[PDB]
Amino acid sequence: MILGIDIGGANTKITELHENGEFKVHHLYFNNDKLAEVLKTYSNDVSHVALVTTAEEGVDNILNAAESAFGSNISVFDSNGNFISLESAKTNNMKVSASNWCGTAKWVSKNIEENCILVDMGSTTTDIIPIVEGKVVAEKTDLERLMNHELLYVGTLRTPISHLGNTISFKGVDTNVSSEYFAITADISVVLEKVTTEEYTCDTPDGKGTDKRSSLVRISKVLCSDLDQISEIDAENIAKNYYELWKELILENVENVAEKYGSKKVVITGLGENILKDALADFEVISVAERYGKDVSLATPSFAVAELLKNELLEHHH
Amino acid sequence: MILGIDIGGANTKITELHENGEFKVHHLYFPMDKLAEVLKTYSNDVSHVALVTTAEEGVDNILNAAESAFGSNISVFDSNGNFISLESAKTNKVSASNWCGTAKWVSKNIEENCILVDMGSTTTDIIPIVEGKVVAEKTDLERLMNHELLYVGTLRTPISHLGNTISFKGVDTNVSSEYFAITADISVVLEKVTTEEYTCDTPDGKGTDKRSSLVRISKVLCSDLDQISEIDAENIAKNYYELWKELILENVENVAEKYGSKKVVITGLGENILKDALADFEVISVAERYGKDVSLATPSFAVAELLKNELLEHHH
Ligand SMILES: [Ca+2]
């Protein structure tokens, strides 16, 4: 078996690649060694990728925990998109860190499409990186990606509503909105049924319920109102109009990156795949959730590196 | 000697209006009365204006907290624009805008046909005054729908609220949606307010100085001072300050066009930004005519004057 380990601190994902062809994606929340070792039975090679950040390096703990769980057969994914040894190479922290899109993009360029745009929308961000002739050609830093529209800050859950726009069409009139932290995209998604109530993973702006009504109450606060001054149907239209700005913002950013290299194909994945295929309907859409299943779509980084590792192996031999 | 009491929830402003016209503004803030008495001697009449709401009725909690420190010489300001007795407040209209009291004052002592523009730490009120009558909408909702309420302030406005893209090194650049920088960072960097005028907390709970603001701004573009220069981060502030002024001006133009108004009376913490953004109009600065202390506590000053003008009027 080949494992794809994606440790992101809050939630570490594991992809098991079996030789009979099937795979399994696992989710974990939270001693790390004893934990990882339970997934070590029958493992010959493991690709390790750190999706987390400098939050509270500690990269020494993950490497040591992974090494005592899987041995020396560990390949960590570089910050450049290359596999390097657990030994020395990565044991020297820096160079280990990786983005949420690098492995995924490299995996797409070699297994799904050589010329396209990878659009990965999580809960907070949307990565939009171009792939040309089998090569990932996005900028390296987030700053350079923001300047190149390869990084857009719109997610399915944690995006403040006014980030989408400081004015919105309300009752046929362009209406100014509050800047206070009252509602987020999670509220929009719940109200428009783009996500079930069980997917509202982040804390609510007010600390109240995640239900459809509570969301509408939070939305109402964007126009300094409440479910008394306005109806639930009016607050619902607020969310629908914002959903429109949401898709529109995604499209223009993707169109812009597409124009650079004439790419006409997009490959979508992540929490916001439903939203993505709605906003990018004009392009030829290749859905990861349709081709590999929803779980892979929600844990692409771990799956991508496991496949890259397994392909390099079969390639090394053959 | 008249007292203009302005209670805004947990923060209150008290104006001392002496006979000869001399005045002294007092800013009070404390966790909750007793200190209301430290200013009761040598005081006859007093006006009361509560420019705050509730947020988890609750009016008696203070009107009685004053009646015990000012007897019944208190004249509370209505939400309809007129003064009324404590009795009418106790039994009921007592709570109101941060702008009504001020507007009324402007339409009698400053100008009858204009637009009052009050930019505080968080909001900007744009209420039109026509023929001496404040003709702005009632609720906040209606005002947001009529460019009479703009949610941008001198201090606590999340930067991306001004625009989710910004011009950087000549390119349309996307920005982070995370709470990293607020308008207070812009004001301090462009010296539109003093370092000591940075009231609200800082996003990263750090210094309110120049550099500390540039550090937070850099984060709006997923960067820091090791990746971009201080001049660069400052250009980010300037460009955002532009979108800021543009946003204010557009809202003021929509209202001006509706009422043919040509004059603007600006007041509030962000007066320096207001007179800059509204340079095209005929600008009447409250801070330049009455001093900064008045532009920072206009509500309490207005009711102080209004009451006086009515007392010297009930004598006819
Ligand atoms: Ca480059």
Describe the structure.
It is classed as structural genomics, unknown function. In chain A, 38% of the residues lie in helices and 21% in strands. The first copy, chain A, has a 6-stranded mixed sheet. In chain A, strands 7, 8, 9, 10, 13 and 14 form a 6-stranded mixed sheet that branches. A two-stranded antiparallel ribbon of chain A has the order 11-12. In chain A, helix 7 packs across helix 8 (212-220), helix 7 (185-191) packs across helix 9 and helix 9 crosses helix 10 (273-279). Chain A folds into 2 domains: 2-98, 2-Layer Sandwich (Nucleotidyltransferase, domain 5); 99-318, Nucleotidyltransferase, domain 5. Chain A contains 13 helices and 14 strands. Chain A is globular. Chain A is an alpha/beta fold and 318 residues long. The A-B interface holds A 124, 141-143, 146-147, 149, 151-154, 158-160, 162-166, 170-171, 173, 175-181, 223-225, 229-230, 249, 253 and B 122, 139-141, 144-145, 147, 149-153, 157-158, 160-164, 168-169, 171, 173-179, 221-223, 227-228, 247, 251. The structure holds calcium ion.
Chain-wise SSE layout:
Two copies of one chain form a homodimer.
Chain A: E1 2-7, E2 11-17, E3 23-29, H1 32-37, E4 45-50, H2 59-70, E5 74-77, E6 83-85, H3 86-90, H4 102-111, E7 116-121, E8 126-132, E9 135-136, H5 142-147, E10 151-152, H6 161-164, E11 167-170, E12 173-176, H7 185-191, H8 212-220, H9 232-261, E13 265-269, H10 273-279, E14 284-287, H11 288-291, H12 294-297, H13 300-316
Parallel strand pairs in A: 1-4, 4-5, 7-13, 13-14
Antiparallel strand pairs in A: 1-2, 2-3, 5-6, 7-8, 8-9, 8-10, 11-12
Helix pairs in contact in A: 4-13, 7-8, 7-9, 8-9, 9-10
Bound molecules: calcium ion.
